[PDB]
């Protein structure tokens, strides 16, 4: 079992925090909030570094470029913005969604950004021009998550319509659709590190690990509370192989990936833990909570 213990609490956002993400080079933690701001913090000591602003409404997601120099954010103002972290400047504003932009991510090459919106589409944007390359009629309800696989050739998207679909990046055509015996809202999805599996959250208090090639569920994780918010889930790989997720009972849950047994529950936040992230090299977890809390916590484990 790991032994995560709270090391720092980061305060500064004025409304609920929406997401937290460690930079690939591991020196920074970035946070997005409904306060329309993005904040950068030192990953190991929680040191407040800077505030990046410009969006006109709340932000639901922020993601790093592979070289840790850029960020892309998704906002209710219907745009995504690409930022240069060092200067804090907005390099491009991506316009084209007709409603809130919910999720975003850079491909490994970092030449593309994929986005998901309440407008039910998935868009692929050219980073250098800031122009939309493709618009995919991906789903029939809001799009909760979008993520590229390891070589960037695939994109996985999820939606409240209960589906998780995999798309061919170059053509934008759908390669496969995954559906359980039922279709509760799919609130989050992402490929595993090697791109072979897909971790999916559904609003019935359940996380599932799917085999992409076989389209079958390999593991199911339960015990937490998740029926209302789109809560992120992560693969923790620096030490023991865990599955990490926030929960509506204000705790961070950690499961053993293979056994599916819960190995630790982190107590401390005073509101729904909406987002968690795992450090790329150290056994460190960042967690963020909603309105009654609005803080970010950094936890560290020996294993």
């Amino acid at each position: 079992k790991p032994n995560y213990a709270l090391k720092f609490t980061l305060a500064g956002h004025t409304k609920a925090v929406s997401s937290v993400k460690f930079s690939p080079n591991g020196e920074w933690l970035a946070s997005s909030s409904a306060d329309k701001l993005i904040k950068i913090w030192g990953a190991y000591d929680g040191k407040f570094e800077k505030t990046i602003s410009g969006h006109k409404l709340g932000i639901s997601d922020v993601a790093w470029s592979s070289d840790s120099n850029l960020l892309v954010s998704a906002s209710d103002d219907k745009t995504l913005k690409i930022w240069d972290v060092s200067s804090g400047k907005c390099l491009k504003t991506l316009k084209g969604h007709s409603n809130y932009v919910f999720c975003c991510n850079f491909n490994p090459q970092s030449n593309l950004i994929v986005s998901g919106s309440f407008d039910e589409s998935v868009r692929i944007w050219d980073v250098k021009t800031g122009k939309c390359l493709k618009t995919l009629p991906a789903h029939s309800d809001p799009v909760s998550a979008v993520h590229f696989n390891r070589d960037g050739s695939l994109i996985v998207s999820s939606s409240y319509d209960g589906l998780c679909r995999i798309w061919d990046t170059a053509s934008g055509q759908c390669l496969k659709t995954l559906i359980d015996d039922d279709n509760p809202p799919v609130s989050f999805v992402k490929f595993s590190p090697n791109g072979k599996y897909i971790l999916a959250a559904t609003l019935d208090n359940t996380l599932k690990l799917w085999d992409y090639s076989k389209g079958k569920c390999l593991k199911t994780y339960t015990g937490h509370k998740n029926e209302k918010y789109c809560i992120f889930a992560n693969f923790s790989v620096t030490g023991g192989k865990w599955i990490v997720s926030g929960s509506e009972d204000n705790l961070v849950y950690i499961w053993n990936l293979q056994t599916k047994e819960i190995v630790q529950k982190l107590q401390g936040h005073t509101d729904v833990v909406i987002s968690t992230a795992c450090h790329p090299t150290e056994n460190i977890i960042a967690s963020a909570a909603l309105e009654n809390d609005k803080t970010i916590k950094l936890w560290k484990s020996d294993c």
Binding site: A16, S18, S60, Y100, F102, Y160, K228, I274, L290
Partner: peptide, 6 residues
């Protein structure tokens, strides 16, 4: 945003 229930 993600911070509100939809």
């Amino acid at each position: 945003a993600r911070t509100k229930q939809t």
